[PDB]
Amino acid sequence: STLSYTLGQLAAHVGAEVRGDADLPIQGLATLQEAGPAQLSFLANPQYRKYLPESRAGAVLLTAADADGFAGTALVVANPYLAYASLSHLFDRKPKAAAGIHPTAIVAADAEVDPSASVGAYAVIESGARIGAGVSIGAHCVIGARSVIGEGGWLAPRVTLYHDVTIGARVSIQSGAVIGGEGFGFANEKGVWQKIAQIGGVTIGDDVEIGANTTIDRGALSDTLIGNGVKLDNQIMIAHNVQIGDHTAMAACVGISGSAKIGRHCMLAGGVGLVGHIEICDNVFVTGMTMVTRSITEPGSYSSGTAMQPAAEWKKSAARIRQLDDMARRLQQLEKRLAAV
Amino acid sequence: STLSYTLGQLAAHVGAEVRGDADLPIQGLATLQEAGPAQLSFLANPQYRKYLPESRAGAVLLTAADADGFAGTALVVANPYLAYASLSHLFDRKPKAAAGIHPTAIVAADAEVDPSASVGAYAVIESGARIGAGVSIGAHCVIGARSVIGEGGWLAPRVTLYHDVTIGARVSIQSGAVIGGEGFGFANEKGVWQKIAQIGGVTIGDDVEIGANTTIDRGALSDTLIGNGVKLDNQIMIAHNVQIGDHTAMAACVGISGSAKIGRHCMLAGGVGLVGHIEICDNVFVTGMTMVTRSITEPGSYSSGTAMQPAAEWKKSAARIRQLDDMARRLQQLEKRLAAV
Amino acid sequence: STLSYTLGQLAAHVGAEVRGDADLPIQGLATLQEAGPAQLSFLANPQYRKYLPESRAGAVLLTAADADGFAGTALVVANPYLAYASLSHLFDRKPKAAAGIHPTAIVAADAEVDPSASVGAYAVIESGARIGAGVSIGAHCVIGARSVIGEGGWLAPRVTLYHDVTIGARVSIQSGAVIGGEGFGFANEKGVWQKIAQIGGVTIGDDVEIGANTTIDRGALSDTLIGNGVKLDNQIMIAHNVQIGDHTAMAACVGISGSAKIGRHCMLAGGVGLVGHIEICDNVFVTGMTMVTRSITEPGSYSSGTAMQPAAEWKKSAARIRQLDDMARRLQQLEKRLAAV
Ligand SMILES: [Mg+2]
């Protein structure tokens, strides 16, 4: 038996006005070009407006504007994209575990697990750990000594928290994430690296998302700090003592070096790197695979790298870059020569 | 007791003609410069032809051409590299598990495991999952609800499949891979990110390889699609709703943003990034650490970045790049000035 | 009850001279600006000397030079940073497991575990594996067939060693690391990739650190080789048959392609990539996100990429780079034209 809702139930959830029959049953969501008659669609991007009248969707989330002249059933909302975002959860088939501790889970006698929490098979909860109400700990999770997960948290299978990791409410952590590991902390003695113990922890705020195989190092002395509402994609590396301001988003494969500070409402595109000990102010966007080498004090977008070219053309551009000092010297000599005549 | 074959047994496996004694016992494979008399070698690259007459190998896989004038035992084949590739499997010491389910594995009552499959210690197989004939599931694997693995599949220890992941035949997945995780799917409401449930799945074709700690996100609505014969190296990130055509290879640390479409027989070198919502046609090669920012409609090689220089020279080139608009303006003024005289 | 030492106990550990009262109790370490009166601090960087007289630290590790004129308690040492590095371990709260094998660990009958080793819950130790004295194997580790870990080794929870991985003494491996996986080894037959079995192993030296979710591939024929004292940060990818010389450090998100050889005392900054089959000599530094495309035969620093600019300025620089061949041709025509007049 598949999940099903009427257009009326869906419209109630997002405060939509149904212009058509509210009793139509809906079995899922789809984009305008993919949608069939049992699916609700949405128009967010003016670029996809071409596909609205030909869509086979049973109904479409629309602005009052885009609903005028439209022949199908409209669900009229201020913001179709946000309404889609809310409705998506009603069609999620991710399994939900019942409250309880799997018989194979190992829970230290002085760990506290809320009775409304679920702890999966072969999970390990260490001494002093605290698991809050409505938290779901997946199979094979390891929750280190004294670590805390706030109410409504969700950990996929195979998440690792080291000791002294404190997490706020409603965390979402995908499989393979490692939180509180020891980062690269070495002192050089005449060429031989000497380990510095990493004796800070991690503090994570509320409503944080952490993607698959993302690593967040513990602090060297004080904590690594992740603010509220921070969204981290997959394969991210956050080094020791990084600070991430509230509502910042980081796309996949981002790497942030030690002690960097990122402000609120920043957006780092995929594969961005930040060097250590710099600060980025609020409302900064960094485009894909940029290397950020210094502090940013002005809001706006920032970039590094070159345009992609066909390889033979790129090789010519790269050869000319190495000649730029020579070309600048030649341009200066030419200006002096023309001035003289 | 070590693996051992005669030159005759090896030659039979690849259809080689033995020019010398077929009874010579062989204990392994080696490159021409490393090989000793108990090892079979091969000449693939004309650059290594220098090392052929001095090689201590017991025998060498050779073309008819390179076997003429050669003093040792030749195994004569059309393609020495492909023959090496085939013979390597005869000397693999990777352990093979016997059919059966380890007593500590947890298998849902309505999961189906073929009796010829092996399921390792502390594996978890969820409701509705299907494990095909001759499949090997390593220790600590987690196989989500309704997920499918086709015949002859091999999962290393500690592979995670989320729910609704469908895999074709003869998959090979290395440890730490995460398939079907929730990718970065958020709607921005006045600076606050709102989660979009990721309610598509993943469809993987036949003869696919997935390397260690590689992540492949589930689709937002429809599936993320990986074609037949696709080979993915380690630490790759495949975002939601990516489509990868048949026989495409991607080297390590590649990141593909959401909804990108890659054609057949493409090759992405290490650390390549693709932005979202672009298409690459068939037979495209992208060189290492290139950022692909737009659709590619012509087959061939493509590149971005700069040449490596000594740091002091690089710093001068990077300073001149920032002056290029000024230099272009100055070159234009000079042309106008010379024209006028 | 918290860890506490007197200034005298701390000074004895690093050979410091206490200029003040040796009986002062110390509960931790802190930087000069963060430190309170129960904490020991240090002055390493001349840039932080501003903050020395105003620091609330109970005492400070100082050179004889910086101790002259200082009003507080000094612990006088040759090298405050190295003394900090040594003292950090005295304040580490990482849990230490007692010797023994957890009842849920699975240990092959012909594996050898030293009785002073600790093996955590749900660990799997395969046939022929050898675990040395004082080794700590975390929960959910998998130690493949015939693999060896030398005395004093520490594996976090959820480390995977494949078969035929040999590790020297005093290894430190963070969670999620995968050692000995099969790397991208394929032969192309008219567009179809054919697997090459990866039948080498891995050899790791003494005093090696491996960070979280780092992958180190096994060799194709001979071993992948990691020297003594090599320090690898998180999310690193080491491909098949790489050789890393002693005392080399690699920051996070570094990727080294197959068969590359790195010398002794090298330092690769974060996100560096190396192409395959190249050699880097001793004492080479490569700056962040550089693509190394050829062998380096001269010690020193090396870089690639461009300076970060505001996006609109970057777009202008990137457009001019594509015009450099045209600009060079125009500069040449102008020189010829001026010469002629
Ligand atoms: Mg990367």
Start-to-end CA span in chain C (Å): 90
Which residues on neighbouring strands pair with residue A231, listed in sequence order? A209, A249
State the distance from the centre of ligand 1 to the C-alpha of A234, rounded, in angstroms. Answer: 11
Mapping DSSP onto H, E and C, the string for chain C reads: CCCCEEHHHHHHHHCCEEECCCCCEECEECCCCCCCCCEEEECCCHHHHHHCCCCCCCEEEECHHHHCCCCCEEEECCCHHHHHHHHHHHHCCCCCCCCEECCCCEECCCCEECCCCEECCCCEECCCCEECCCCEECCCCEECCCCEECCCCEECCCCEECCCEEECCCCEECCCCEEEECCCCEEEECCEEEECCCCCCEEECCCCEECCCCEEECCCCCCEEECCCCEECCCCEECCCCEECCCCEECCCCEECCCCEECCCCEECCCCEECCCCEECCCEEECCCCEECCCECCCEEEECCCCCEEHHHHHHHHHHHHCHHHHHHHHHHHHHHHHHC
**Residue appearing with tokens 């080479």:** C284
State the distance from the centre of ligand 1 to the C-alpha of A66, rounded, in angstroms. Answer: 42
β-strands A209-210, A231-232: how paired? parallel
Judging contacts by C-beta atoms under 8 Å, the chain A residues touching residue C316 are: none
Inter-chain touch A231–B184, beta carbons under 8 Å:
yes
**Residues of C marked as catalytic:** 240
Options B13, B102, B163, B240, the catalytic residue:
B240
* Nearest-CA distance A267 → chain C (Å): 14
Looking at this protein, which amino acid is placed at residue A164? D
Inter-residue contact B61 to B16 (CB < 8 Å): yes
Q: Report the CATH superfamily, name and number, of domain C101-341.
A: Hexapeptide repeat proteins (2.160.10.10)
- In CATH terms, the fold of domain B1-100 is 3.40.1390
C120 in B contact zone (CB under 8 Å): no
Looking at this protein, which amino acid is placed at residue B42? F
B240 is catalytic: yes
State the distance from the centre of ligand 1 to the C-alpha of A240, rounded, in angstroms. Answer: 18
Judging contacts by C-beta atoms under 8 Å, the chain A residues touching residue C158 are: 140, 142, 158, 160
Inter-residue contact B218 to B178 (CB < 8 Å): no
CA distances from A303 to A143, A171, A310, C271 (A): 39, 31, 21, 16
- Obtained via which technique? X-ray
What is the spatial distance between Cα C288 and Cα A257, in angstroms, rounded to a whole number? 10
The alpha-carbon radius of gyration of chain A (Å, integer) is 26
Residue in chain C nearest A188 by alpha carbon: C82
Judging contacts by C-beta atoms under 8 Å, the chain A residues touching residue B193 are: 209, 229, 231, 247, 249
| CA atoms within 13 Å, Cβ hemisphere of A261 | 10
Mapping DSSP onto H, E and C, the string for chain B reads: CCCCEEHHHHHHHHCCEEECCCCCEECEECCCCCCCCCEEEECCCHHHHHHCCCCCCCEEEECHHHHCCCCCEEEECCCHHHHHHHHHHHHCCCCCCCCEECCCCEECCCCEECCCCEECCCCEECCCCEECCCCEECCCCEECCCCEECCCCEECCCCEECCCEEECCCCEECCCCEEEECCCCEEEECCEEEECCCCCCEEECCCCEECCCCEEECCCCCCEEECCCCEECCCCEECCCCEECCCCEECCCCEECCCCEECCCCEECCCCEECCCCEECCCEEECCCCEECCCECCCEEEECCCCCEEHHHHHHHHHHHHCHHHHHHHHHHHHHHHHHC
Judging contacts by C-beta atoms under 8 Å, the chain A residues touching residue C236 are: none
Quick one: tokens of C192? 């179809």
State the distance from the centre of ligand 1 to the C-alpha of B239, rounded, in angstroms. Answer: 14
Non-local CB neighbours of B9 within 8 Å, separated by 6+ positions? none
Tell which residue, A115, A111, A116, A169, has the closest CA to residue A142: A111
Q: Residue ranges of the domains in chain A? A: 1-100, 101-341
Tell which residue, A219, A250, A220, has the closest CA to residue A237: A250
CB < 8 Å from A in window 280-339 of C: 288-289, 305-312, 314-315, 318-319, 321-322, 324-325, 327-328, 331, 334-335, 338
CB < 8 Å from B in window 271-290 of A: 271, 288-289
Tell which residue, A147, A152, A185, A155, has the closest CA to residue A170: A152
Q: Say which DSSP state A320 is in.
A: H
Q: Say which DSSP state A326 is in.
A: H
CB < 8 Å from A in window 159-218 of C: 172, 174-176, 209, 211-213
State the distance from the centre of ligand 1 to the C-alpha of C281, rounded, in angstroms. Answer: 24
Inter-residue contact C280 to C262 (CB < 8 Å): yes
Quick one: tokens of C330? 């125009």
Non-local CB neighbours of A85 within 8 Å, separated by 6+ positions? B186, B187, B194, B195, B196
Quick one: tokens of B87? 């013979």
A64 in B contact zone (CB under 8 Å): no
What is the spatial distance between Cα A268 and Cα A249, in angstroms, rounded to a whole number? 6
Non-local CB neighbours of A23 within 8 Å, separated by 6+ positions? A6, A7, A8
Give the A:C interface size as CB pairs under 8 Å.
229
Inter-chain touch A193–C311, beta carbons under 8 Å:
no
Q: For the beta carbon of residue C255, count every other beta carbon within 10 angstroms.
A: 29
Inter-chain touch B34–C187, beta carbons under 8 Å:
no
Tell which residue, A220, A211, A226, has the closest CA to residue A178: A211
Inter-chain touch C92–A321, beta carbons under 8 Å:
no
Which residues on neighbouring strands pair with residue A78, listed in sequence order? none
| CA atoms within 13 Å, Cβ hemisphere of C260 | 23
Residue in chain A nearest C333 by alpha carbon: A334
Judging contacts by C-beta atoms under 8 Å, the chain C residues touching residue A176 are: 176, 213
* Nearest-CA distance B191 → chain A (Å): 6
Q: Say which DSSP state A72 is in.
A: S
